[PDB]
Ligand SMILES: Nc1nc2c(ncn2[C@@H]2O[C@H](COP(=O)(O)OP(=O)(O)NP(=O)(O)O)[C@@H](O)[C@H]2O)c(=O)[nH]1
Protein backbone atom coordinates (compact mmCIF):
# COMPACT_ATOMS: atom_id res chain seq x y z
CA UNK A 1 0.00 0.00 0.00
CA UNK A 2 2.53 2.66 1.06
CA UNK A 3 5.00 4.25 -1.38
CA UNK A 4 7.13 7.37 -1.82
CA UNK A 5 6.78 9.95 -4.58
CA UNK A 6 8.09 13.26 -5.88
CA UNK A 7 6.62 16.03 -8.05
CA UNK A 8 8.52 16.73 -11.28
CA UNK A 9 7.63 20.22 -12.48
CA UNK A 10 7.73 21.87 -15.88
CA UNK A 11 8.27 25.56 -16.62
CA UNK A 12 4.54 26.32 -16.91
CA UNK A 13 4.10 25.30 -13.24
CA UNK A 14 2.48 21.96 -14.12
CA UNK A 15 3.79 18.76 -12.54
CA UNK A 16 3.70 14.98 -12.71
CA UNK A 17 4.11 12.89 -9.57
CA UNK A 18 6.51 9.96 -9.97
CA UNK A 19 6.89 6.92 -7.72
CA UNK A 20 10.25 6.65 -5.93
CA UNK A 21 10.80 2.88 -5.89
CA UNK A 22 14.12 3.29 -4.01
CA UNK A 23 13.21 6.24 -1.80
CA UNK A 24 15.79 9.04 -1.76
CA UNK A 25 18.27 6.63 -3.41
CA UNK A 26 16.13 6.66 -6.59
CA UNK A 27 18.18 7.92 -9.56
CA UNK A 28 17.42 10.42 -12.32
CA UNK A 29 17.31 7.55 -14.84
CA UNK A 30 14.77 5.69 -12.67
CA UNK A 31 12.60 8.82 -12.33
CA UNK A 32 12.71 9.36 -16.11
CA UNK A 33 11.50 5.76 -16.53
CA UNK A 34 8.69 6.61 -14.10
CA UNK A 35 7.35 9.48 -16.25
CA UNK A 36 4.64 9.14 -18.93
CA UNK A 37 7.20 9.44 -21.71
CA UNK A 38 8.05 7.22 -24.65
CA UNK A 39 11.62 6.26 -25.48
CA UNK A 40 10.74 8.71 -28.26
CA UNK A 41 9.97 11.65 -25.93
CA UNK A 42 12.55 10.80 -23.19
CA UNK A 43 15.91 11.27 -24.98
CA UNK A 44 15.40 15.06 -25.38
CA UNK A 45 14.88 15.82 -21.68
CA UNK A 46 16.25 15.10 -18.24
CA UNK A 47 15.86 16.11 -14.60
CA UNK A 48 17.11 19.46 -13.34
CA UNK A 49 17.24 20.77 -9.79
CA UNK A 50 16.22 24.42 -9.63
CA UNK A 51 15.76 27.11 -7.03
CA UNK A 52 15.13 30.82 -7.62
CA UNK A 53 18.82 31.58 -8.29
CA UNK A 54 20.49 28.30 -9.33
CA UNK A 55 19.35 25.70 -11.87
CA UNK A 56 21.52 22.64 -12.51
CA UNK A 57 21.11 19.71 -14.90
CA UNK A 58 21.50 16.41 -13.03
CA UNK A 59 23.36 13.36 -14.32
CA UNK A 60 21.49 10.08 -14.90
CA UNK A 61 23.26 8.51 -11.89
CA UNK A 62 22.48 11.37 -9.46
CA UNK A 63 19.94 10.85 -6.70
CA UNK A 64 17.83 14.03 -6.99
CA UNK A 65 16.15 13.84 -3.56
CA UNK A 66 19.62 13.76 -1.97
CA UNK A 67 20.53 16.92 -3.92
CA UNK A 68 17.40 18.58 -2.52
CA UNK A 69 18.43 17.45 0.99
CA UNK A 70 21.98 18.77 0.46
CA UNK A 71 20.97 22.03 -1.26
CA UNK A 72 22.42 24.32 1.43
CA UNK A 73 25.80 22.60 1.05
CA UNK A 74 25.59 22.67 -2.77
CA UNK A 75 24.75 26.40 -2.68
CA UNK A 76 27.71 27.02 -0.34
CA UNK A 77 30.05 25.12 -2.70
CA UNK A 78 28.86 26.72 -5.94
CA UNK A 79 27.55 30.19 -4.99
CA UNK A 80 27.22 32.88 -2.29
CA UNK A 81 23.41 32.68 -2.07
CA UNK A 82 20.98 32.95 0.84
CA UNK A 83 20.29 29.22 1.39
CA UNK A 84 17.10 29.70 3.49
CA UNK A 85 15.29 31.43 0.60
CA UNK A 86 16.33 28.82 -1.98
CA UNK A 87 13.98 25.85 -1.79
CA UNK A 88 14.72 23.62 -4.76
CA UNK A 89 12.28 21.65 -6.88
CA UNK A 90 12.87 19.01 -9.54
CA UNK A 91 12.03 19.90 -13.14
CA UNK A 92 11.82 18.12 -16.47
CA UNK A 93 13.76 20.31 -18.91
CA UNK A 94 15.60 20.13 -22.23
CA UNK A 95 18.87 18.20 -22.05
CA UNK A 96 21.62 20.80 -22.60
CA UNK A 97 23.49 18.18 -24.65
CA UNK A 98 20.63 17.80 -27.18
CA UNK A 99 22.11 18.58 -30.62
CA UNK A 100 20.21 21.17 -32.66
CA UNK A 101 20.34 18.79 -35.66
CA UNK A 102 18.39 16.22 -33.60
CA UNK A 103 15.88 18.79 -32.30
CA UNK A 104 15.20 20.08 -35.80
CA UNK A 105 13.66 16.74 -36.88
CA UNK A 106 11.34 16.33 -33.86
CA UNK A 107 7.69 15.70 -34.85
CA UNK A 108 6.30 14.30 -31.58
CA UNK A 109 3.51 16.57 -30.27
CA UNK A 110 4.39 16.03 -26.58
CA UNK A 111 8.12 16.66 -27.09
CA UNK A 112 7.24 19.78 -29.07
CA UNK A 113 4.89 21.19 -26.40
CA UNK A 114 7.47 20.58 -23.64
CA UNK A 115 10.26 22.31 -25.63
CA UNK A 116 7.83 25.07 -26.58
CA UNK A 117 6.80 25.74 -22.96
CA UNK A 118 10.44 25.94 -21.91
CA UNK A 119 11.36 28.23 -24.82
CA UNK A 120 8.44 30.56 -24.04
CA UNK A 121 9.60 30.68 -20.41
CA UNK A 122 13.10 31.75 -21.46
CA UNK A 123 11.73 34.31 -23.93
CA UNK A 124 9.47 36.04 -21.39
CA UNK A 125 12.24 36.05 -18.73
CA UNK A 126 14.61 37.93 -21.10
CA UNK A 127 17.19 35.17 -21.68
CA UNK A 128 16.69 35.31 -25.49
CA UNK A 129 18.34 38.31 -27.14
CA UNK A 130 17.08 38.98 -30.68
CA UNK A 131 16.22 41.87 -33.00
CA UNK A 132 12.84 43.61 -32.67
CA UNK A 133 11.50 41.86 -35.79
CA UNK A 134 12.19 38.37 -34.40
CA UNK A 135 10.59 39.21 -31.06
CA UNK A 136 7.54 40.60 -32.88
CA UNK A 137 7.22 37.38 -34.91
CA UNK A 138 7.50 35.30 -31.72
CA UNK A 139 4.84 37.47 -30.06
CA UNK A 140 2.48 37.00 -33.02
CA UNK A 141 2.87 33.21 -32.79
CA UNK A 142 2.11 33.32 -29.06
CA UNK A 143 -1.12 35.22 -29.79
CA UNK A 144 -2.20 32.55 -32.31
CA UNK A 145 -1.25 29.72 -29.93
CA UNK A 146 -2.85 31.22 -26.81
CA UNK A 147 -5.85 33.12 -28.26
CA UNK A 148 -6.59 31.25 -31.51
CA UNK A 149 -7.52 33.01 -34.75
CA UNK A 150 -7.36 36.78 -35.00
CA UNK A 151 -10.84 38.32 -35.09
CA UNK A 152 -11.12 42.02 -35.91
CA UNK A 153 -14.00 42.39 -33.42
CA UNK A 154 -11.86 41.07 -30.54
CA UNK A 155 -8.29 42.12 -31.39
CA UNK A 156 -8.05 45.20 -33.60
CA UNK A 157 -8.30 47.77 -30.77
CA UNK A 158 -8.00 47.78 -26.96
CA UNK A 159 -6.68 44.21 -26.83
CA UNK A 160 -2.87 44.46 -26.57
CA UNK A 161 -2.65 46.24 -23.19
CA UNK A 162 0.33 46.10 -20.79
CA UNK A 163 -1.07 43.02 -19.00
CA UNK A 164 -1.50 41.14 -22.32
CA UNK A 165 1.92 42.18 -23.65
CA UNK A 166 3.57 40.64 -20.56
CA UNK A 167 2.58 37.17 -21.84
CA UNK A 168 4.09 37.59 -25.36
CA UNK A 169 7.27 39.75 -25.14
CA UNK A 170 10.38 39.68 -22.94
CA UNK A 171 10.00 41.43 -19.57
CA UNK A 172 13.10 43.48 -20.50
CA UNK A 173 11.23 45.02 -23.47
CA UNK A 174 7.88 45.75 -21.78
CA UNK A 175 8.53 49.33 -20.68
CA UNK A 176 10.45 51.00 -23.51
CA UNK A 177 10.10 48.90 -26.71
CA UNK A 178 6.97 46.72 -26.64
CA UNK A 179 4.35 49.52 -26.43
CA UNK A 180 5.59 50.68 -29.87
CA UNK A 181 5.24 47.21 -31.41
CA UNK A 182 1.51 46.62 -30.99
CA UNK A 183 0.46 47.39 -34.58
CA UNK A 184 3.34 45.33 -35.97
CA UNK A 185 2.45 42.40 -33.69
CA UNK A 186 -1.26 42.63 -34.57
CA UNK A 187 -0.39 42.72 -38.30
CA UNK A 188 1.63 39.53 -38.14
CA UNK A 189 -0.99 37.89 -35.91
CA UNK A 190 -3.76 38.69 -38.42
CA UNK A 191 -1.53 37.41 -41.26
CA UNK A 192 -0.95 34.09 -39.47
CA UNK A 193 -4.66 33.51 -38.93
CA UNK A 194 -5.77 34.40 -42.47
CA UNK A 195 -2.95 32.50 -44.23
CA UNK A 196 -4.24 29.04 -45.22
CA UNK A 197 -0.63 27.98 -45.92
CA UNK A 198 0.02 28.34 -42.17
CA UNK A 199 -1.18 25.22 -40.36
CA UNK A 200 -3.21 26.06 -37.24
CA UNK A 201 -2.58 22.64 -35.68
CA UNK A 202 -1.25 23.35 -32.18
CA UNK A 203 1.97 21.32 -32.50
CA UNK A 204 2.67 22.88 -35.90
CA UNK A 205 2.37 26.40 -34.47
CA UNK A 206 4.50 25.45 -31.45
CA UNK A 207 7.17 24.07 -33.79
CA UNK A 208 7.10 27.31 -35.80
CA UNK A 209 7.76 29.13 -32.53
CA UNK A 210 10.72 26.79 -31.85
CA UNK A 211 12.03 27.26 -35.40
CA UNK A 212 12.21 30.99 -34.68
CA UNK A 213 14.08 30.34 -31.41
CA UNK A 214 16.69 27.94 -32.79
CA UNK A 215 18.90 30.66 -34.29
CA UNK A 216 18.85 32.74 -31.08
CA UNK A 217 22.41 32.62 -29.68
CA UNK A 218 21.42 31.47 -26.17
CA UNK A 219 18.83 28.87 -27.26
CA UNK A 220 18.99 25.76 -25.05
CA UNK A 221 21.60 27.27 -22.74
CA UNK A 222 22.36 26.15 -19.22
CA UNK A 223 22.95 29.31 -17.19
CA UNK A 224 25.49 29.81 -14.44
CA UNK A 225 26.10 32.90 -12.33
CA UNK A 226 29.33 34.87 -12.03
CA UNK A 227 31.06 38.25 -12.16
CA UNK A 228 33.42 40.09 -14.47
CA UNK A 229 35.50 43.16 -13.71
CA UNK A 230 35.33 46.02 -16.24
CA UNK A 231 38.56 46.48 -18.25
CA UNK A 232 37.72 51.12 -11.25
CA UNK A 233 37.47 47.47 -12.20
CA UNK A 234 33.77 47.84 -11.55
CA UNK A 235 31.99 44.53 -10.91
CA UNK A 236 29.37 43.35 -13.41
CA UNK A 237 27.33 40.33 -12.28
CA UNK A 238 26.67 38.09 -15.27
CA UNK A 239 24.86 35.01 -16.43
CA UNK A 240 27.17 32.55 -18.18
CA UNK A 241 25.16 30.71 -20.84
CA UNK A 242 26.60 27.47 -22.22
CA UNK A 243 24.82 25.60 -25.03
CA UNK A 244 25.53 23.44 -28.07
CA UNK A 245 26.57 26.60 -30.02
CA UNK A 246 29.11 28.06 -27.58
CA UNK A 247 29.47 30.54 -24.70
CA UNK A 248 27.30 33.59 -24.00
CA UNK A 249 27.53 36.27 -21.33
CA UNK A 250 24.48 38.25 -20.25
CA UNK A 251 24.39 41.23 -17.93
CA UNK A 252 22.50 39.79 -14.94
CA UNK A 253 20.46 42.94 -14.28
CA UNK A 254 19.57 43.92 -17.86
CA UNK A 255 19.94 40.53 -19.64
CA UNK A 256 21.94 42.44 -22.29
CA UNK A 257 24.12 40.17 -24.44
CA UNK A 258 27.71 41.17 -23.61
CA UNK A 259 29.45 38.60 -25.81
CA UNK A 260 28.57 35.50 -27.82
CA UNK A 261 31.26 33.06 -28.97
CA UNK A 262 30.82 29.98 -31.17
CA UNK A 263 32.83 26.79 -30.57
CA UNK A 264 36.03 26.80 -32.61
CA UNK A 265 36.41 30.60 -32.22
CA UNK A 266 37.50 30.70 -28.56
CA UNK A 267 39.51 28.82 -25.93
CA UNK A 268 39.05 28.44 -22.17
CA UNK A 269 41.23 27.77 -19.16
CA UNK A 270 40.02 26.88 -15.68
CA UNK A 271 41.76 29.26 -13.26
CA UNK A 272 44.32 27.55 -11.01
CA UNK A 273 42.40 29.11 -8.10
CA UNK A 274 39.21 27.30 -9.30
CA UNK A 275 37.20 30.44 -8.51
CA UNK A 276 37.25 31.54 -12.16
CA UNK A 277 37.89 30.67 -15.80
CA UNK A 278 39.58 32.62 -18.60
CA UNK A 279 38.31 32.96 -22.17
CA UNK A 280 40.49 33.79 -25.18
CA UNK A 281 38.59 35.07 -28.22
CA UNK A 282 40.08 34.59 -31.71
CA UNK A 283 40.67 36.94 -34.64
CA UNK A 284 40.55 39.50 -31.85
CA UNK A 285 43.46 39.06 -29.39
CA UNK A 286 40.82 39.81 -26.73
CA UNK A 287 40.52 38.01 -23.42
CA UNK A 288 38.44 38.08 -20.24
CA UNK A 289 38.06 36.30 -16.91
CA UNK A 290 34.73 35.24 -15.41
CA UNK A 291 34.72 34.78 -11.63
CA UNK A 292 32.43 32.07 -10.34
CA UNK A 293 32.49 29.06 -8.02
CA UNK A 294 30.65 27.28 -10.86
CA UNK A 295 33.83 27.67 -12.99
CA UNK A 296 34.50 23.92 -12.84
CA UNK A 297 30.99 23.09 -14.03
CA UNK A 298 31.21 25.65 -16.85
CA UNK A 299 34.53 24.34 -18.18
CA UNK A 300 33.39 20.70 -18.01
CA UNK A 301 30.25 21.57 -20.00
CA UNK A 302 32.24 23.60 -22.57
CA UNK A 303 34.53 20.59 -23.07
CA UNK A 304 31.57 18.24 -23.51
CA UNK A 305 29.56 20.40 -25.91
CA UNK A 306 32.62 21.43 -27.95
CA UNK A 307 33.56 17.73 -28.09
CA UNK A 308 30.13 16.88 -29.56
CA UNK A 309 30.57 19.18 -32.53
CA UNK A 310 31.53 17.73 -35.93
CA UNK B 311 -6.95 36.71 -15.59
CA UNK B 312 -8.77 34.76 -12.87
CA UNK B 313 -7.48 31.33 -11.82
CA UNK B 314 -9.78 28.31 -11.53
CA UNK B 315 -8.89 25.27 -9.45
CA UNK B 316 -10.55 22.25 -11.05
CA UNK B 317 -10.33 18.65 -9.84
CA UNK B 318 -10.97 15.50 -11.90
CA UNK B 319 -12.20 12.62 -9.71
CA UNK B 320 -13.36 9.05 -10.30
CA UNK B 321 -12.28 5.43 -10.13
CA UNK B 322 -9.39 3.74 -11.91
CA UNK B 323 -9.32 3.52 -15.70
CA UNK B 324 -12.36 5.73 -16.46
CA UNK B 325 -10.34 8.23 -18.55
CA UNK B 326 -9.60 11.10 -16.16
CA UNK B 327 -6.09 11.55 -17.54
CA UNK B 328 -7.20 10.97 -21.14
CA UNK B 329 -9.84 13.70 -20.84
CA UNK B 330 -7.44 16.09 -19.14
CA UNK B 331 -4.61 15.47 -21.63
CA UNK B 332 -6.96 15.80 -24.63
CA UNK B 333 -8.24 19.11 -23.24
CA UNK B 334 -4.86 20.57 -22.28
CA UNK B 335 -2.46 19.06 -24.83
CA UNK B 336 -4.69 17.88 -27.70
CA UNK B 337 -3.22 14.37 -27.48
CA UNK B 338 -5.08 11.09 -26.96
CA UNK B 339 -3.42 8.96 -24.28
CA UNK B 340 -3.66 5.35 -25.49
CA UNK B 341 -1.41 3.55 -22.99
CA UNK B 342 -2.78 3.05 -19.47
CA UNK B 343 -0.43 4.53 -16.88
CA UNK B 344 -2.09 4.80 -13.44
CA UNK B 345 -1.86 8.34 -12.09
CA UNK B 346 -0.36 9.22 -8.73
CA UNK B 347 -1.16 12.95 -8.92
CA UNK B 348 -0.71 15.27 -11.91
CA UNK B 349 -1.48 18.97 -12.31
CA UNK B 350 -1.99 20.85 -15.57
CA UNK B 351 -2.33 24.51 -16.47
CA UNK B 352 -4.30 25.85 -19.46
CA UNK B 353 -5.43 29.34 -20.46
CA UNK B 354 -8.82 29.38 -22.19
CA UNK B 355 -11.53 31.89 -23.08
CA UNK B 356 -14.94 31.43 -21.44
CA UNK B 357 -17.76 33.96 -21.70
CA UNK B 358 -15.47 36.66 -23.15
CA UNK B 359 -12.76 36.42 -20.47
CA UNK B 360 -9.38 34.75 -20.27
CA UNK B 361 -9.27 32.07 -17.56
CA UNK B 362 -6.27 30.19 -16.20
CA UNK B 363 -7.34 26.64 -15.38
CA UNK B 364 -5.32 24.61 -12.91
CA UNK B 365 -6.54 21.05 -13.35
CA UNK B 366 -5.73 18.39 -10.77
CA UNK B 367 -5.77 14.93 -12.34
CA UNK B 368 -6.16 12.54 -9.41
CA UNK B 369 -5.50 8.86 -8.71
CA UNK B 370 -8.49 6.55 -9.18
CA UNK B 371 -6.80 3.42 -7.81
CA UNK B 372 -6.54 5.49 -4.61
CA UNK B 373 -4.92 13.53 0.13
CA UNK B 374 -8.58 13.46 -0.97
CA UNK B 375 -10.04 15.77 1.70
CA UNK B 376 -7.35 18.31 0.73
CA UNK B 377 -8.29 18.09 -2.98
CA UNK B 378 -11.88 18.91 -2.08
CA UNK B 379 -10.95 21.69 0.35
CA UNK B 380 -8.86 23.49 -2.29
CA UNK B 381 -10.89 22.68 -5.40
CA UNK B 382 -13.43 25.15 -6.78
CA UNK B 383 -15.03 22.79 -9.32
CA UNK B 384 -15.24 19.01 -9.66
CA UNK B 385 -15.60 16.66 -12.62
CA UNK B 386 -16.86 13.29 -11.41
CA UNK B 387 -16.01 10.81 -14.15
CA UNK B 388 -17.15 7.23 -14.73
CA UNK B 389 -16.89 4.94 -17.74
CA UNK B 390 -20.16 3.97 -19.46
CA UNK B 391 -18.35 0.65 -19.94
CA UNK B 392 -17.97 -0.19 -16.21
CA UNK B 393 -20.85 -0.31 -13.69
CA UNK B 394 -18.61 -0.21 -10.61
CA UNK B 395 -17.09 3.14 -11.66
CA UNK B 396 -20.59 4.65 -11.88
CA UNK B 397 -21.53 3.17 -8.47
CA UNK B 398 -18.36 4.62 -6.89
CA UNK B 399 -19.33 8.25 -7.58
CA UNK B 400 -22.13 8.61 -5.01
CA UNK B 401 -19.68 8.54 -2.09
CA UNK B 402 -17.38 11.09 -3.81
CA UNK B 403 -20.28 13.51 -4.33
CA UNK B 404 -21.22 13.12 -0.66
CA UNK B 405 -17.59 13.60 0.43
CA UNK B 406 -17.34 16.88 -1.52
CA UNK B 407 -20.54 18.27 0.06
CA UNK B 408 -19.26 17.30 3.53
CA UNK B 409 -15.85 18.95 3.08
CA UNK B 410 -17.37 22.10 1.53
CA UNK B 411 -20.26 22.07 4.02
CA UNK B 412 -22.74 23.05 1.29
CA UNK B 413 -24.80 21.70 -1.62
CA UNK B 414 -23.72 24.72 -3.67
CA UNK B 415 -20.56 23.25 -5.21
CA UNK B 416 -19.62 23.53 -8.91
CA UNK B 417 -19.79 19.98 -10.25
CA UNK B 418 -20.31 17.97 -13.43
CA UNK B 419 -21.10 14.26 -13.89
CA UNK B 420 -19.21 12.78 -16.84
CA UNK B 421 -19.93 9.44 -18.52
CA UNK B 422 -16.72 8.88 -20.47
CA UNK B 423 -15.84 6.43 -23.29
CA UNK B 424 -19.10 7.15 -25.17
CA UNK B 425 -17.33 6.17 -28.41
CA UNK B 426 -17.57 2.58 -27.08
CA UNK B 427 -21.32 2.05 -27.71
CA UNK B 428 -20.74 -1.70 -28.21
CA UNK B 429 -19.44 -2.02 -24.63
CA UNK B 430 -22.01 0.25 -22.92
CA UNK B 431 -23.12 -1.03 -19.51
CA UNK B 432 -24.40 2.19 -17.90
CA UNK B 433 -27.36 3.56 -19.88
CA UNK B 434 -27.48 7.30 -20.57
CA UNK B 435 -30.77 7.59 -18.68
CA UNK B 436 -29.14 6.05 -15.60
CA UNK B 437 -26.49 8.79 -15.81
CA UNK B 438 -29.20 11.42 -16.28
CA UNK B 439 -31.11 9.95 -13.30
CA UNK B 440 -28.08 10.23 -11.02
CA UNK B 441 -27.46 13.85 -12.11
CA UNK B 442 -31.08 14.75 -11.24
CA UNK B 443 -30.73 13.00 -7.87
CA UNK B 444 -27.73 15.30 -7.30
CA UNK B 445 -29.78 18.49 -7.09
CA UNK B 446 -30.03 18.77 -10.90
CA UNK B 447 -26.26 18.43 -11.44
CA UNK B 448 -24.70 19.14 -14.85
CA UNK B 449 -24.26 15.99 -16.96
CA UNK B 450 -22.40 15.05 -20.15
CA UNK B 451 -21.37 11.90 -21.95
CA UNK B 452 -17.84 12.36 -23.29
CA UNK B 453 -15.09 10.70 -25.30
CA UNK B 454 -11.41 11.56 -24.87
CA UNK B 455 -10.68 9.43 -27.96
CA UNK B 456 -13.27 10.98 -30.32
CA UNK B 457 -13.02 14.50 -28.81
CA UNK B 458 -16.69 14.52 -27.81
CA UNK B 459 -17.69 17.00 -25.08
CA UNK B 460 -14.11 17.27 -23.74
CA UNK B 461 -13.75 21.08 -23.58
CA UNK B 462 -17.39 21.37 -22.46
CA UNK B 463 -16.59 19.59 -19.16
CA UNK B 464 -14.11 22.27 -18.11
CA UNK B 465 -15.94 25.28 -19.60
CA UNK B 466 -19.09 24.30 -17.72
CA UNK B 467 -17.21 24.15 -14.41
CA UNK B 468 -15.79 27.63 -15.08
CA UNK B 469 -19.29 29.00 -15.76
CA UNK B 470 -20.54 27.39 -12.54
CA UNK B 471 -17.70 28.96 -10.51
CA UNK B 472 -18.54 32.34 -12.08
CA UNK B 473 -22.17 32.40 -10.86
N1 LIG C 1 -12.11 4.20 -26.24
C1 LIG C 1 -11.81 5.11 -25.27
N2 LIG C 1 -10.79 4.83 -24.43
C2 LIG C 1 -10.45 5.71 -23.44
C3 LIG C 1 -11.21 6.95 -23.29
N3 LIG C 1 -10.67 7.62 -22.25
C4 LIG C 1 -9.65 6.86 -21.78
N4 LIG C 1 -9.53 5.72 -22.49
C5 LIG C 1 -8.55 4.63 -22.29
O1 LIG C 1 -8.77 3.99 -21.04
C6 LIG C 1 -7.52 3.71 -20.39
C7 LIG C 1 -7.47 4.46 -19.07
O2 LIG C 1 -7.47 5.87 -19.32
P1 LIG C 1 -6.80 6.87 -18.26
O3 LIG C 1 -7.10 8.28 -18.71
O4 LIG C 1 -5.39 6.44 -17.99
O5 LIG C 1 -7.74 6.51 -17.00
P2 LIG C 1 -7.61 7.18 -15.55
O6 LIG C 1 -8.98 7.52 -15.08
O7 LIG C 1 -6.66 8.47 -15.61
N5 LIG C 1 -6.90 5.95 -14.56
P3 LIG C 1 -6.15 6.30 -13.05
O8 LIG C 1 -7.16 6.72 -12.04
O9 LIG C 1 -5.42 4.94 -12.60
O10 LIG C 1 -5.08 7.47 -13.28
C8 LIG C 1 -6.43 4.15 -21.36
O11 LIG C 1 -5.99 3.00 -22.09
C9 LIG C 1 -7.12 5.14 -22.27
O12 LIG C 1 -6.56 5.19 -23.59
C10 LIG C 1 -12.31 7.18 -24.25
O13 LIG C 1 -12.99 8.22 -24.18
N6 LIG C 1 -12.54 6.24 -25.18
Ligand SMILES: [Mg+2]
Pocket residue numbers: 326327328343344345367368369
Ligand atom coordinates in the same frame (compact mmCIF):
# COMPACT_ATOMS: atom_id res chain seq x y z
MG1 LIG D 1 -4.99 8.90 -14.67
